[model samples]
Target chain A: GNIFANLFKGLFGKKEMRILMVGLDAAGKTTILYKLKLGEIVTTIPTIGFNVETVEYKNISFTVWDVGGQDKIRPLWRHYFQNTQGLIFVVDSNDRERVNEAREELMRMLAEDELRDAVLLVFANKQDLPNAMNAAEITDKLGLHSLRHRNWYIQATCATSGDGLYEGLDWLSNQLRNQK
Target chain B: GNIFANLFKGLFGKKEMRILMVGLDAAGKTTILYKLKLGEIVTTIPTIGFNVETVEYKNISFTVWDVGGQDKIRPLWRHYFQNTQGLIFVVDSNDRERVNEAREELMRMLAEDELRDAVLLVFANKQDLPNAMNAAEITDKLGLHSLRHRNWYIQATCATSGDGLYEGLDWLSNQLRNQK
Candidate 1:
């Protein structure tokens, strides 16, 4: 039924991509999504398990699901991972104390055999902060390059400022296109 | 009586070192202590305000205190800050997310008016891991250079393998002796 529904929509409409954005609580996951949508700083509310945003670019639709980062609620993250054409792991480059918790969560997902083929993009969010870590540091710490055989990329950008977000998204779109 | 004795011993000790090893739970802080001893681990338990360890180098004895990373427990971290000659911030650099959290926590400490005069050393623990962030990034993100004005310093280390640990300590000791 779902396949049929998607096919029917595609027959007359645009193809869609599903994306998952995850990190720890207060890591600015929600803020990044808000910036992508509003294109500016706006009042933000913390995300629970998931919030869906449908963004259309060049007639292609992307359903970006921004999820909560709390460890307790991460079980729900698994459900969202299903049908995920790509993954965007947003990390707080400045919060080293809790970065392990986020890294563990992301690694758990990648270890699952089912999602091994998923495209991974790490958004090293919050680059503007004086104490923010650099992209190379983030990659080395997360072991991003060595984690999987699939296409993986890391982007350094201030999610709040929307800088390099589209660059990340565009890269994801390219990966998705190559997948098919 | 025990508390008072320890308090006076701490106060009157000829030389002391305030070592703050920080990382998320399971970062091998406890294990590294035993490894550093090169034999059986000390009878150390979980840290309270801070765990103090006395190790001798040449004629001078160093008193190292392990501080609890728990947020609530950290309010008491300030208690150990008094007369702190140096600090060792332990971080699991291989784990990106935790590194960020630790840096944020460390930043909070740097902002504390009490920690204005102590030297800082950051142990980028778990460098053996395939994906460990480097010290340069940690320094950049934590704004380590700025702390020089506060008479503070930082170094990268891996306690798990004892990598860079001695260099960090030696550097701090030299600074301490210079101050004397």
Candidate 2:
């Protein structure tokens, strides 16, 4: 993911942002992508491949790629990392057992040279569930404070309730429009 | 609030930290400070002046200053901000009435040059209340997402139950302490 700050407007004269969403399997990546695409939450299965959607928010067209996070399939995540301007790292807040794994994956991705310039938007999903970790807890586990000169934010979100879905995009959109 | 990261060991040979705790009136800040000092919730009236106690946690000594938060007295908060390394901003999770006010005061305080490098720890107190807001809810209400390049965290806390009190200090200690 590279800086798009000086890039010219796209074909339609609207700014476009490429976002890649991935996290541990069953962290609700598909559910969230669909929730943003459509207004309702539909039944879902473990994504064997990826789902691509164009979500328009705050006048910016975001082309989002949702890659499957199944353990074996995670190695292929790098293939989708190119040209990504925004990275959405979804996490199941209710599942603390795999938080460390999520952290490792995130650190691995951020280490990739391609994603170094991409602003990070972490969705601490499943916030409606009782005992779910809040953004601060997830921030600590994700080692966000230790990051040097990285632009990152964590949003408490529940695709089911649609509580923080748009707020996350609000941040993403702001990040893109920040050069002004 | 001098940076104690490199300061010589205090008389006790322990790392000593100066923390200033402030928020809207009746946000349970005094209660939280006293709970850490006494290890039990005590009957409290509105903080008259400021309550100072050295709470030792994780081998670091935290002298938290729980100061008055009355509307007219907030102007004096800056006097306590000097040499402060960490800020404990308490919030009443059950009262949405003052969340906007809390946001304004926080943004205002963080803009102060003296407190620029201080880490922010927001305690969303009153978690035991049935209708209390969670950490994330308070974070959004406090407009935390808009903060820029600032180190901040919000913990769901209940002074009466003693939930999330020391954990807040743990983060402060870690913020001041460096990696091996």
Candidate 3:
């Protein structure tokens, strides 16, 4: 029992974390995963099930999973949530209607007992354009407040320019550390 | 005829109003159409040659068009822009690199004289993710200041969540009603 708790605590104490990226197809989920891994531009093959990359920033190791975004393939997505410490929901910030789909997914995640304590992050990518909505607006609309209430950290990001991504990741690491 | 101009001002102004929603395939363009109409959430065979719907609200009528997001069918989108009043560039904010694709397409619109003068509204939809970029970050990366200076408005909206959408429409209507 002592060794088991020590092992669990070691994994949970912030030396490493498992994060999942999920969203609709073409929502740029895979692109963000590669960009984070190489810290520069990297081409992507349409992800089949999941693409896992282990990245070390400082002493923290992040196991990031870029999962499939297709509706037909979502069954496999459920298996990944079993032990996810953190989750990132990616969406095309320009697609107003799909936001609901993402919101629904979030609700589903919230309903799950295993993910109830998971830290959440959102990447509102593609921030270049005149009509693109703002953070406050998107936050309010997607019921992000619900996640906030549950202790989730939400950050607006532009994956192309690397605008808010680093900040979001830093925040995520902090959130995980605090959970220790 | 003085009172008539006031009433006519309301009616004619709205009749001439044109609202455009643009985005990539599966970006919720069709779902948004259904949301605006409050009708069937019909699965489209992919938007081609534009989906025109004339809707009336209070004293104004809106001629809204949902253009195909396909790369091959964009040539036909311009024909409907004749006497265009407003432009809504829908973006999949979840996808960062596609921002370049949106930029290239928007550049084409700016080159058109009619579209140049049209009211610009960008809907940065999909804000229900852990890593999705925020609207402010998105606008900055997209250079939103230029749009406002060029007589446009930018907004971050989640169409499915129905956030900031009414406000977007209100601003769009104001732009149309003020037009000569």
Best by TM-score: 3
TM-score of 3: 0.42
Pairs that collide in candidate 2 are A1-A114, B1-B83, B1-B84, B2-B83
lDDT accuracy of residue B139 in candidate 1: 74
- Per residue, candidate 2 scores C-alpha lDDT tens digits across B1-180 of 122332312322444445667777667754554445432211211233333434444334344433335544354456656647777888889988778888877777788887888888899998988989899888889888888877888889887666887677667657765511
TM per model?
0.40, 0.40, 0.42
Estimate candidate 3's alpha-carbon lDDT, on a 0 to 1 scale. Answer: 0.57
Q: Which candidate, 1 or 3, has the higher TM-score?
A: 3
User: Candidate 1, residues A1-180: lDDT per residue as tens digits?
Assistant: 122123224322345445666666556664554444422211111232223334333333334433335422535545555666677888888887776777787787788665767788898877888988899888878877776467889999886566777777667767766556
Ranked by lDDT, the better of candidates 1 and 2 is 2
lDDT of 2 by residue, A1-180 (tens): 112222213222444445777787768775565545422211111232233334444334344443334422534445556657778899999999989999987888788888888889999999988989999999999999999978889999997666787777777767756842
Per-candidate total of colliding backbone pairs: 19, 4, 42
Each candidate: RMSD: 18.6, 22.5, 20.0
Off by over 4 Å in 1: A1-16, A38-76, B1-180
